């Protein structure tokens, strides 16, 4: 069951593509703060984990479409990663 590793790879891809496309969509909109790659990657993590502090968010339509993709693919893949971790921890419970 190493497809948890496959889920982790998809999540990292979603995070990286989200960071690249968010900066691409948000630059050109006056007032936008999601405009440099390092903090855009931090924003992708915030969204994939659904934490959503609100220190960063998109204000353009395409940035918000990029966010929707990061929500759908990122929350799903992140859900597969934590599910795997939870099942593994339940396995150690059995060892007692």
């Amino acid at each position, epitope marked *: 069951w190493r497809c948890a590793g496959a889920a982790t790879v998809l999540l990292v891809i979603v995070l990286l593509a989200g960071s*690249y496309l968010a*900066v*691409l969509a*948000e*630059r*050109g*909109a*006056p*007032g*936008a*703060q999601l*405009i*440099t*790659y*390092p903090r855009a990657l931090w924003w992708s993590v915030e969204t994939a984990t659904a934490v959503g502090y609100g220190d960063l968010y998109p204000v353009t339509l395409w940035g918000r479409c990029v966010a929707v993709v990061v929500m759908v693919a990122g929350i799903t893949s992140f859900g597969l990663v934590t599910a795997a971790l939870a099942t593994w921890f339940v396995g150690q419970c059995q060892q007692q």
Partner: antibody, heavy 118, light 108 residues
Framework: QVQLQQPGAELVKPGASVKLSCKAS????????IHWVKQRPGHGLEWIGE????????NYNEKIQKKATLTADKSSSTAFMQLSSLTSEDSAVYYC???????????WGAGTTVTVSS | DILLTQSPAILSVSPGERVSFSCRAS??????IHWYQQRTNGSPRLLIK???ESISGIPSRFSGSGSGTDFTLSINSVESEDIANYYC?????????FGSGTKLEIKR
């Protein structure tokens, strides 16, 4: 090595156009943005616009009259700024600069002195 | 659009003194401010990034400080080669903007 090479000067007739070039060297990344900055003699720096060569999209300073058009060519690693229908107000030094997508201008070209005159 | 105010516009100093350049933003921009030096007929050259981080190749006497709206660039013991124009620039919100610049003059 000089990382951004610009021609030294361009003479343009009033009403004519010119295409400035900026040839990049060194490390190039997909996160690279090329910026253009205008400096009239005795004045400060004025941001014109930006382009991401790895994708080709450009944005422009919305506070000044739109006079420039940015393009790039990944083959020659050269960014271009088309200045069209120039007047005396457009006579200035035009720098290009590289930003690694992290907000600051690590590297500047030497600048192209553009004179609009008959 | 972030307005960056550099006041005063000219700074007159004796050699070896400490000098401080002021940059103030029209709203809070965290630490996303960067400093450049431009000598006569030269290109801008990055001195400090992100308000206080040093750049490889810049003398140790250059430092920066501040966050929010008030930022300052400092030269420990000014020297003749520091005679130039100094510009701040913000990257917190689109579009990037430059301050109007401060000239450094040395009283010798």
């Amino acid at each position: 090595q000089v990382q951004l090479q610009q021609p030294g000067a361009e003479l343009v007739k009033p009403g004519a156009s010119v295409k400035l070039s900026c040839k990049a060297s060194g490390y190039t990344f997909t996160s690279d943005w090329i910026h253009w900055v205008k400096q009239r003699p005795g004045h400060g720096l004025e941001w014109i616009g930006e382009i991401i060569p790895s994708y080709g999209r450009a944005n422009y300073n919305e506070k000044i009259q739109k006079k420039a058009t940015l393009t790039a060519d990944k083959s020659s690693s050269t960014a271009f700024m088309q200045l069209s229908s120039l007047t005396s107000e457009d006579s200035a030094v035009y720098y290009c600069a590289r930003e690694r997508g992290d907000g600051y201008f690590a590297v500047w070209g030497a600048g192209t002195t553009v004179t609009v005159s008959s | 659009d972030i307005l960056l105010t550099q006041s005063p516009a000219i700074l007159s100093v004796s050699p070896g003194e400490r000098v401080s350049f002021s940059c103030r933003a029209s709203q809070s921009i965290g630490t996303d401010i960067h400093w450049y030096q431009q000598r006569t007929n030269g290109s801008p050259r990055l001195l400090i990034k992100y308000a206080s981080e040093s750049i490889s190749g810049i003398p140790s006497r250059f430092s920066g400080s501040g966050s929010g709206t008030d930022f300052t660039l400092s030269i420990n013991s000014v020297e003749s080669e520091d005679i130039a124009n100094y510009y701040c620039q913000q990257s917190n919100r689109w579009p990037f903007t430059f301050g109007s610049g401060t000239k450094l003059e040395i009283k010798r």
